[PDB]
From TrEMBL, chain B:
The lineage of its organism: Bacteria, Bacillati, Bacillota, Bacilli, Bacillales. Transmembrane segments: none annotated. This is DNA primase. Residues 173-327 form the SF3 helicase domain.
Length: 431, 375, 349, 348
């Protein structure tokens, strides 16, 4: 578009020169296109839109080569300079303001069945690749091209599928879950309302899988936020414009006192996002959360919602020896062929809900026991009328160094579950 | 109005050119309308008002196609560009300043009997819809049209009234309370003095009900504010521009350090902050809704604090029963369902919140738990 | 004054045009009045004053309709537009600066016997209403007019005096204290250095009655704890009284004591220079029980006031019964007619 | 000085007009004095100084009627407007900048023997009052006038010396100590390295005495602090330009540093920390022994106890409400304190 804009600017300048000649020599000869005329030409030839009608919203420009609308003022000013090189920053701002006044308002395309990919948009319902068009309004895209794959690409005799199987310790459910996680991570408009947690201790490859995800997806498309960082100031501003968020290492057993923002982001629940000294606003984030940590951190709420939102992935394979191959995380996962094959395999995979592995269910139950002492008691206690005896301070806090209640909130245990009444029956080794 | 403003701009430019030609060549072809003349033209042909006379009060413009006065600067700038394309940001700001000096002051119409919706104004005293007029001063309207509903819409065998009953666990008192809650949610110029708290756990539909409320009200017309985040810097800055505020989630048994601001908000007692605008004091009549598990305790416990809150039970579990996702991301987004909900709720007459028996039992339980003295 | 300023501006523009004509066609036609000339005309034909010569003090203009000096730059700029509509914001700031340079310095009147009302100024020494004059300097006034009445207006058979006694547990001393509280509250330009506090019910309805007898715009909502922080005191300009609801069972004693007294305070505006200003608005705060009093000083108990609130308290009272114009006029008349010099001590507390 | 500047105005303007006339109709009648010329005229006909060469040091103007130098920008702007009304805020700022470039640098007279009051400068070395001159550099003065006196003024037949003795339980030693305390309090350039503590059980006239001591000094010359918050940050900021600090009740290293003349680290909000020396005297009143947790030699030596006990805890409400506000009693007590001279406080 540089050639077209250069030619347009040259012809407009020649026309202005001819008009000045025919009108006579009055003042200095005009040589700079007026900002209003420049904006008219840009609107006529290029494609400029406005995402909304709110206060001082930024004009968006469609990059024909990129295929995605951008709000970056630097690119727009470079295009303006292509049309008119003599305009300084103020004149470029004036041109942008005129374009904002002129162009029409179209909302962002937020269809969950459309996924922007470097080659072009991907229609999940049709399972096809459609070429880029200005009709689809996108602000970001996956940095990996979509090409048809038939044979697994092997680099230095190393197979991505075999590596995935190795990471899962040869478990079909876990590899299926991992492929599903990749597919969910690529989609930025569908959430599935589940929180992905990579739980594993020592060398396991959690970071390698996270780097693979950050490589197949755009690196700039990945946010970095640990679960405990959600609830403080300015942190949600990172989530804006990101397809997924990855927590590299959550501290072991961190106390998540506040989980409202985390729960909102996990689901499609709207939340108040605030930028640093910018007008805060309400927005909805559909990006999936993926966290890697050694052991499962415990939450203050320890209720049904945090249980149903959480998903745990096993990383039991250990490479803390000669088995460790640095090139897997340094070079192999950066291979373009491997990334393209991974993207193809993940995007072609289709499903509606995550397939929970049996091991994940076991660890989910273990986390439920650990975080909630009541359920740990209920599991450990494997009669009915005696409430004081079965209470016994949670039978001495079921030997987990927990804190008990005043035997009033303990009966919330029958919420997890003592069918109702004797009149004579109502530390200790002892049921 | 774009065509009208273009016609007036062309006519004014032609008149100025003729005056310059008859005067000679001293003016060197004046082609831009002066900002004061632009302000005069806009005031004469459009409807610009000033809500009230204080420091840095923003001009309001009546959108003829929308029927609501807006203080959005960008819209006014676009209108000015319609009148005069060649004005930059500074000249358009000059036009806005001249209009602010020129226009008269009118206060926003805050009558609990008038409710604006996409179709027009709705009057409860007479119970009918009226076309938009500049006389009615409104800053935000509900994004759902008001139409006459004869039959309850059903999609894929899913009925909105049946869904409400399922959420409410088949009790007439609680469904009446939900309908009254919705009716209060549309009306942002009146308060019922009782906070709304969707208390539940797991797949209880409180999030689905909140999403339904947001959809019927309109996404842009509702803002999300926390119960704990009621009093802090640069917060509550966009709350005034929305008809209602809902808390998506609240921590279980969360301690409240500043509930006086919360009490002022729920009761209607009177302070906004902005990046480049001085603090302004106003009352809050928008309804307050919070979704949570249990009833969080408050350090300002008293008769008034307890009576100012209302507990809405959500005792339905949708995990054992196979949940329909299309209920939450597809069904409640349908225009017909939203229109029926708006019609049914706005036609309902409001006097006070009809307290269900289950709500009374949960209120008594919370009273016993928060204050052991009574128990 | 809009017609006067319009006529003056038209006359000045015509005179400038004639002066340019007699000098011949030299440059472009002068069509806008220079800001210095506008400032001269405004100073001659209007009343502009300066409260004090402090750093970056703001010009005050006498509103003839209201009778009170105001520092609102928007109203002043509207007056500028009346005189000269072609001046943008910068030229209006320039003319305001010139006026600030020219105008005389006068101190705000703080006579206890003079209290501004929407109808006029009430003098307690003669107990009489007088028309507005620029000679008296006021910054705020009551928005309920003062009228002469001899009866107690009754709406739906409701008596204000009996209701006040019901709230006050039916004691003469406490109801007299309540009337004195009203009298102190409506005085926005004079202060007794007493910080009114509400301890309790019926407190909310009485607070709303106070907020209604005074103009709502004249009321500023602030708590004691929030006086100190930056960019919070600027809302106290031109306010007759400041009423707040401090947390129940929660009290510094910095600038709160300063605003309670007539002492100047360094008030600040966003993106505007700071300046020293004096606020004499009556301070009212509501809470259940005694304030915390972290300071625990005798002078604090000396300055503040405690008003007991004990009752068995009905949505009707809230609307149209305390917002009635007749009720507000009656309570204003009764409170302003009461004459006192020292505060009373109720027998119920 | 408005008349002088007005006379200077439209006289340089006439000179510019006639220069333009003799040069021909080419300047379009320049009727506005250039900012540099305004600075020249102001420097020639007024007294503008600069306190120090610090960054962004504000120009100071000598108010002839007031007798003290001021950095108030508004007054300087008014003076410039008197010279030439047709100046923007930017043009007047340019005039101020040119003056700042022109004027000489002078240091404020911080002599402990010189005390400024509304009538003039009092020198303790000569024990004499001198008229206001631009040679002396003062940024503040005591608002109570100083005149020669021969009798004790009385309001409603009430004495000041009798009242002070009644507060001081009628003992000559403690009365002399109170007079010395006032003398040290008014002097803002000398400390005596003693912290005066008022120990009592109730009012005893200590509150009204502190109110009187605040009244005799300027309104803005007094600071309010308690012991507990000397260690807390940003609390030193209130001592930027004060002459003394007085508390009311007491419900340690920084406090000890403030008591003596050794420098302390003052921190301003959104401003780098800097060390400064405070010569203001500290006076604290409280009920009983003030709280302390660093009992040692330095604290004991630095503290001075002035017990207060009487029946005032008659409540002396008439004395506090209006009697101390009378100008006669204020000038009397100021004169009595200024005449009194001593070297150090006397232990009761
Ligand atoms: N299948 C594999 N076989 C051998 N080495 C592997 C394999 N997968 C990953 N690695 C290597 O093992 C290391 C994994 O490091 P990384 O993934 O950052 O941390 P982690 O194992 O998740 N946790 P930690 O050990 O605490 O740092 C890197 O050197 C990888 O290249
Ligand atoms: N009547 C219904 N029948 C079937 N599914 C339903 C029904 N009502 C709601 N659901 C589904 O149940 C889920 C409830 O929505 P959700 O927002 O997760 O609830 P919630 O009560 O906010 N959960 P939580 O935050 O854990 O307390 C959604 O998937 C709904 O589509
Ligand atoms: Mg790692
Ligand atoms: Mg929810």
């Amino acid at each position: 578009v540089k050639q077209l804009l250069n030619q347009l600017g040259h012809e407009e300048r020649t026309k202005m020169e001819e008009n000045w000649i025919e009108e006579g020599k009055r003042g200095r000869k005009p040589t700079t296109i007026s900002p209003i005329k420049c904006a008219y030409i840009l609107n006529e030839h290029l494609t400029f839109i406005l995402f909304d009608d709110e206060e001082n919203t930024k004009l968006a420009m469609y990059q024909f080569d990129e295929g995605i609308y951008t709000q970056n003022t630097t690119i727009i000013k470079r295009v303006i300079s292509y049309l008119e090189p003599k305009h300084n920053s103020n004149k470029a701002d004036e041109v942008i303001y005129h374009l904002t006044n002129m162009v029409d308002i179209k909302e962002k395309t937020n269809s969950p069945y459309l996924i922007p990919v470097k080659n072009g948009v991907f229609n999940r319902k049709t399972k096809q690749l459609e070429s880029f068009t200005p009709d689809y309004i996108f602000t970001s895209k996956i940095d990996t091209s979509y090409v048809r794959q038939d044979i697994v690409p092997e680099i230095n005799g190393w197979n991505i599928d075999r590596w995935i199987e190795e990471i899962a310790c040869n478990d079909n459910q876990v590899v299926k879950l991992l492929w599903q996680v990749i597919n969910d991570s690529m989609n930025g408009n569908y959430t599935r309302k589940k929180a992905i947690f990579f739980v594993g201790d020592g060398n396991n490859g959690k970071g390698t899988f996270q780097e693979l995800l950050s490589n197949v997806i755009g690196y700039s498309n990945i946010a970095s936020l640990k679960v405990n960082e959600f609830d403080e100031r300015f942190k949600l501003s990172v989530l804006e414009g990101k397809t997924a968020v990855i927590g590299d290492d959550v501290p072991v057993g961190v106390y998540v006192d506040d989980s409202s923002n985390f729960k909102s982001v996990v689901t499609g629940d709207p939340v108040l996002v605030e930028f640093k000294n910018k007008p805060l606003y309400r927005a909805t984030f559909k990006c999936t959360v993926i966290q890697s940590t050694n052991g499962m951190p415990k939450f203050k709420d320890k209720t049904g919602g945090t249980l149903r939102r959480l998903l745990i992935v096993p990383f039991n394979a250990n490479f803390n020896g000669i088995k460790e191959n640095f090139k897997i995380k340094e070079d192999y996962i950066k291979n373009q062929q491997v990334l393209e094959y991974v993207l193809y395999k993940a995007i072609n995979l289709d499903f509606e809900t995550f397939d929970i592995p049996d091991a994940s269910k076991k660890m989910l139950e273990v986390f439920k026991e650990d975080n909630d002492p009541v359920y740990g008691f209920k599991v450990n206690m494997f009669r009915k009328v005696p409430k004081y005896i079965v209470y016994a301070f949670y039978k001495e806090y079921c030997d987990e160094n927990g804190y008990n209640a005043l035997s009033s909130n303990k009966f919330y245990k029958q919420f997890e579950h003592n069918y109702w009444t004797d009149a004579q029956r109502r530390r200790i080794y002892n049921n």
